[PDB]
RNA sequence: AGCUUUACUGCAGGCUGUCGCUGAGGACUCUCACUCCGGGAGGAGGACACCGAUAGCCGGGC
RNA sequence: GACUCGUACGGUCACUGAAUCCUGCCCAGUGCAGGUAUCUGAACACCUCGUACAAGAGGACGAAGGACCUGUCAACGGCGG
RNA sequence: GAAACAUCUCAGUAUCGGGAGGAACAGAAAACGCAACGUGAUGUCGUUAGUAACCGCGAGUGAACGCGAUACAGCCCAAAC
């Protein structure tokens, strides 16, 4: 039979209809008054969190992050530039907003490591994402067969090196065939042309 | 070119700032729960460095000592009141609704409880004209008819120091001393006396703007100079 | 007044001093920032790629 | 100059002389789906757009004749070299 | 190279329409988001404005 | 964020340059500003055609702006054969 | 550089911000498409090739599948119950 989780999932396919719509319209009022990174005791989208690796266990943390919507907040050139490089308004950053959120979260919890993240909506001027972080030093996690991998030294600051799920997609690594000529194994090894 | 003077202003550097650390007080109306049971006694009259006008030190019943925007005619010993039930005499403050039409008012609030915004300069005054349950019409010193919430507080009388403008500065030195007490860069070099690089009107073998002075509202900063969006110019016609 | 020799006479102000962190006489005692190692500005040590040729 | 609307001449299709009708070539409408159309969209961005920032050249004092010659029997037309002509009016 | 402008080409910025935020009953009412005033209660405004996106006009300010 | 512990007797943007006697005529061009029946005026949505969809072509509506009208020279300037 | 120059080129170079390791990164197909009765995670080397593709179709720019090699390794959750 359908799991209860499937119901949370189904509700979020359309965050603008049904009960969920009313919920968001209510919550966001509170969210807008919260800070940039708010640790929350329980995931707003349980199915999504569990699906991404979450576990109701010690050392597993969740935090909601809000980031402004839109293009790059860029300063206009202050020296000579050929027309092609004089733009300001239409320039957008190469990291998606969800990735910016993951980074702001990880900075707030220097000792933790980003496991994954997901969207929880947006209003006219900002977007919210909940990030799942893991304490690589807590024995409850060092002994977990499904999560202890994140304890290895080479997994340090993984979010800042694009090893996150949103990181790998944003780096054009989704495809294994056509189109990934300059993305795999890394953007840098391919001369930054991805 | 280089940023024009009006652009250097916005950065808020020392040269353009007001000597705030030398200012006395932000003359906002006192806040009262209700009732009006708030009266105080003028304890002294002082000079206000920020407005070149006299201000009054008042000691209120509940032990509060604060400077007040003084109307003309307030002297030491006088008793002032603030509140809905305040008496209707010069120097007292009460919501426009409690004020009788045809009476000169000063330090009028824009939004109820903001402490006063309009008519605060030397010798000026607003004129309360119309009353109502919805709007109190006031005539500001510029001649404009301003619709206000009857709940906006105001002080009865005209602001003290009237006629300050009647006397000429006579000499640069007098201007100098006044300017030193304001957020302003003085003296003023005409744009036409500058180089092309420093101003839209700079340059030329002789002094004259090199274009018409009436600039559009949409002109960007650095170019919006001269007669801004002038509906007309000159004295004729 | 000449900008040269005559204007050198007024130079009796102490600015750059021996730095607590790097030992160089670059700790600006007015700014409390070392121009050489960055002490007072950053926990990380001041360093730039342009301090050497690009391919080196 | 003047010119007959119809006259006998060689039809490269029938492969024999027949009465043709002369018409001035009317400009066909563009679709905006040609390769050049997509390149204009693809390549135009921030700043100058190279060739796509250029504007229409000028005019020669006189243009050459631009006509279609239609065979009155098989209906197929053919083109010919034009010749400079300030004006061209057909007779009938 | 600095400077100018009705040189060429662009880039900021301003004005304006539109989409999102955004809701209830070619002109209108409302309150619930949102904005502002108020110590607070509450008041003003209100699906506009701000902000994000885009479109047209102006644009040697660069 | 400066102006601003400021509020039109303010402060911003410009021109002229103490006093005295004065400061004529011109709004066609350029600039600014107001108005505007009509004309023109982008994108979204909408309508027609096209495409089992899409590209695309056209229409309807029409904001600021422009045309047009008006105001304005102590506004750029002009005051001749 | 294009014998000027705006797209293009120099070049995702110089330089800047953040971060890991002894190596990084990648990685067990929603692949390939010598179209097949075929191959079978991923780097890298040789080649494919200055080929396909891009480009005021100017100057210039520029892969991949495959193949020969090196080394080889395949698994764990979410959910159902
Ligand atoms: Cl991390
Ligand atoms: Cl003054
Ligand atoms: Cl012809
Ligand atoms: Cl194969
Ligand atoms: K260049
Ligand atoms: Mg590599
Ligand atoms: Mg005050
Ligand atoms: Mg000063
Ligand atoms: Mg002057
Ligand atoms: Mg000079
Ligand atoms: Mg200039
Ligand atoms: Mg002069
Ligand atoms: Mg002059
Ligand atoms: Mg030059
Ligand atoms: Mg506030
Ligand atoms: Mg220039
Ligand atoms: Mg060249
Ligand atoms: Mg050439
Ligand atoms: Mg290249
Ligand atoms: Mg291939
Ligand atoms: Na962290
Ligand atoms: Na790319
Ligand atoms: Na392209
Ligand atoms: Na020069
Ligand atoms: Na005129
Ligand atoms: Na050359
Ligand atoms: Na040159
Ligand atoms: Na090109
Ligand atoms: Na083969
Ligand atoms: Sr670290
Ligand atoms: Sr105030
Ligand atoms: Sr206040
Ligand atoms: Sr000049
Ligand atoms: Sr006149
Ligand atoms: Sr000295
Ligand atoms: Sr510091
Ligand atoms: Sr460094
Ligand atoms: Sr492109
Ligand atoms: Sr362009
Ligand atoms: Sr010609
Ligand atoms: Sr005079
Ligand atoms: Sr005029
Ligand atoms: Sr293998």
Say if strands A126-134 and A113-122 run parallel, antiparallel, or are unpaired: antiparallel
* Total domains present in chain A: 1
* Total domains present in chain D: 1
Q: Are A19 and A11 in contact (CB under 8 A)?
A: yes
CATH of residue D59's domain is: 3.10.450.80
Question: Which domain, by its residues, includes A117?
Answer: 1-194
- Length, in residues, of chain B: 237
Nearest residue on chain A to D48, judged by CA atoms? Answer: A83
Residue B67: beta bridge partners? B57
Query: Which tokens go with B117?
Result: 């915004």
- B220-B223-B229 Cα angle (round to 5): 80
Please give the span between the terminal C-alpha atoms of chain C, in angstroms, as a whole number: 47
- C7-C10-C11 Cα angle (round to 5): 100
The SS3 of residue A112 is coil
> Strand G: which nucleotides have any atom within 7 A of a protein Cβ?
6-9, 12-16, 18-22, 24-33, 41-44, 54-58, 63-65, 76-81
Distances (CA, A) of B94 to B108, B156, B210, D33, D84: 10, 8, 54, 74, 92
DSSP assigned state of A64:
E
Query: Which tokens go with B7?
Result: 């652009």
CA distance B30 to B35: 14
For the beta sheet containing D16-24, the strands, ordered from the edge strand earlier in sequence to the opposite edge, are D6-11, D16-24, D67-71, D77-78
Distance from CA of D88 to the nearest CA of A (A): 47
The SS3 of residue B94 is strand
Distance from CA of A87 to the nearest CA of D (A): 6
The SS3 of residue A11 is helix
Distances (CA, A) of B114 to A37, B31, B39, B50, B123: 34, 10, 20, 19, 22
Query: Which of 2.102.10.10, 2.40.50.140, 2.60.40.1190, 2.60.40.10 would CATH assign to domain B1-78?
Result: 2.40.50.140
Query: Which tokens go with C42?
Result: 């950053």
Class of domain B82-159: mainly beta
Say if strands D89-91 and D2-4 run parallel, antiparallel, or are unpaired: parallel
Please give the span between the terminal C-alpha atoms of chain A, in angstroms, as a whole number: 44
In Å, how far from its chain's centre is CA C16? 6
- Going by C-beta distance under 8 Å and a sequence separation of 6 or more, which residues neighbour residue B69? B27, B55, B106, B107, B116, B120, B155, B159
B26 backbone dihedrals φ, ψ, rounded to 5°: -95, 90
Q: Encode burial over C44-56: b for 16+ CB neighbours within 10 A, e otherwise.
A: eebeeeeeeeeee
Residue A130: beta bridge partners? A64, A118
B93 backbone dihedrals φ, ψ, rounded to 5°: -120, 135
Query: Which of 2.40.50.140, 2.20.25.30, 3.20.20.80, 2.60.40.10 would CATH assign to domain C1-56?
Result: 2.20.25.30
Cβ of D48 less than 7 A from strand G: yes
Q: Which of A17, A92, A7 is CA-nearest to residue A45?
A: A7
Nearest residue on chain D to A87, judged by CA atoms? Answer: D46
Class of domain B160-237: few secondary structures
Residue B62: beta bridge partners? none
Distances (CA, A) of A103 to A75, A95, A141, B227, C42: 22, 11, 22, 50, 21
**Strands annotated E in chain A:** 37-40, 60-68, 113-122, 126-134
Q: Which of C48, C47, C50, C16 is CA-nearest to residue C33?
A: C16
Q: Which residue is nearest to nucleotide G26 (CA to C1')?
A: A185
Location of structure tokens 């919006």: B224
Question: Which domain, by its residues, includes D34?
Answer: 1-92
The SS3 of residue B58 is strand
Query: Which tokens go with B109?
Result: 């609030």
Is the previous residue joined to B187 through a cis bond, with omega within 30 degrees of 0? yes
CB atoms within 10 A of CB A88: 13
The ligand with the least distance to the CA atom of A176 is 20
Q: What are the boundaries of each domain within chain C?
A: 1-56
């Amino acid at each position: 039979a359908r799991s209860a989780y499937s119901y949370i999932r189904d509700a979020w396919e359309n965050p603008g209809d049904g009960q969920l719509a009313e919920l968001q319209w209510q919550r966001q009022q509170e969210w807008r008054n919260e800070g940039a990174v708010e640790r929350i005791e329980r995931p707003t989208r349980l199915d999504k969190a569990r699906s991404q690796g979450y576990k109701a266990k010690q050392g597993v943390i969740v935090a909601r992050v809000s980031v402004r919507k839109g293009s790059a907040r860029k300063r206009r050139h202050k020296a000579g530039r050929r027309s092609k490089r004089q733009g300001v308004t239409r320039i957008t950053r190469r990291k998606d907003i969800q990735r910016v959120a993951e980074e702001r979260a990880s900075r707030t919890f220097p000792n933790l490591r980003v496991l994954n993240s997901y969207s929880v909506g947006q209003d006219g001027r900002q977007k919210w994402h909940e990030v799942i972080l893991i304490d690589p030093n807590h024995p409850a996690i060092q002994n977990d067969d499904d999560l202890s991998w994140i304890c290895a030294d080479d997994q340090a600051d993984r979010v800042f090196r694009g090893l996150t799920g949103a990181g790998r997609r944003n780096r054009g690594l989704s495809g294994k065939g056509k189109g990934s000529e300059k993305t795999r194994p890394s953007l840098r090894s391919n001369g930054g042309k991805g | 070119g280089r940023r024009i003077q009006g652009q250097r202003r916005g950065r808020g550097t020392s040269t353009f700032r007001a000597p705030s650390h030398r200012y006395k007080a932000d003359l906002e109306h006192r806040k009262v729960e209700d009732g009006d049971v708030i009266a105080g006694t003028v304890v002294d009259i002082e000079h206000d460095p920020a407005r070149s006008a006299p201000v009054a030190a008042v000691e209120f019943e509940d032990g509060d000592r604060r400077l007040i925007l003084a109307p003309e005619g307030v002297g030491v010993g006088d008793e002032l009141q603030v509140g809905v039930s305040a008496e209707i005499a010069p120097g007292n403050t009460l919501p426009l609704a409690e004020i009788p039409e045809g009476v000169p008012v000063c330090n009028v609030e824009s939004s109820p409880g903001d402490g006063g915004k309009f008519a605060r300069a030397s010798g000026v005054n607003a004129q309360l004209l119309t009353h109502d349950r919805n709007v109190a019409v006031v005539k500001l010193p510029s001649g404009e008819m301003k619709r206000l919430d009857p709940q906006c507080r105001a002080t009865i009388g005209v602001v003290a120091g009237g006629g300050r403008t009647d006397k000429p500065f006579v000499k640069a030195g007098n201007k100098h001393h006044k300017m030193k007490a304001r957020g302003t860069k003085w003296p003023n070099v005409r744009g036409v006396a500058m180089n092309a690089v420093d101003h839209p009107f700079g340059g030329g073998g002789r002094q004259h703007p090199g274009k018409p002075k009436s600039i559009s509202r949409n002109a960007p900063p650095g170019r919006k100079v001269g007669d801004i969006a002038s509906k007309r110019t000159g004295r004729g016609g | 007044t000449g900008a040269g020799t005559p204007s050198q006479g007024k130079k009796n102000t102490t600015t750059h001093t021996k730095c607590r962190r790097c030992g160089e006489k670059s700790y600006h005692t007015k700014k409390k920032v070392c121009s050489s190692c960055g002490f007072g500005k950053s926990a990380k040590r001041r360093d730039y790629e342009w301090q050497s040729k690009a391919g080196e | 100059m003047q010119m007959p609307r119809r006259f006998n001449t060689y039809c490269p299709h029938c492969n024999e002389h027949q009465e043709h009708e002369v018409e001035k070539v009317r400009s066909g409408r563009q679709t905006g789906m040609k390769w050049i159309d997509r390149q204009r969209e693809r390549n135009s961005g921030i700043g100058n757009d190279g060739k796509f920032s250029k504007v229409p050249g000028g005019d020669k004092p006189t243009k050459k004749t631009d006509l279609k010659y239609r065979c009155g029997e098989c209906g197929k037309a053919h083109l010919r070299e034009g010749w400079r002509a300030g004006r061209l009016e057909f007779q009938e």
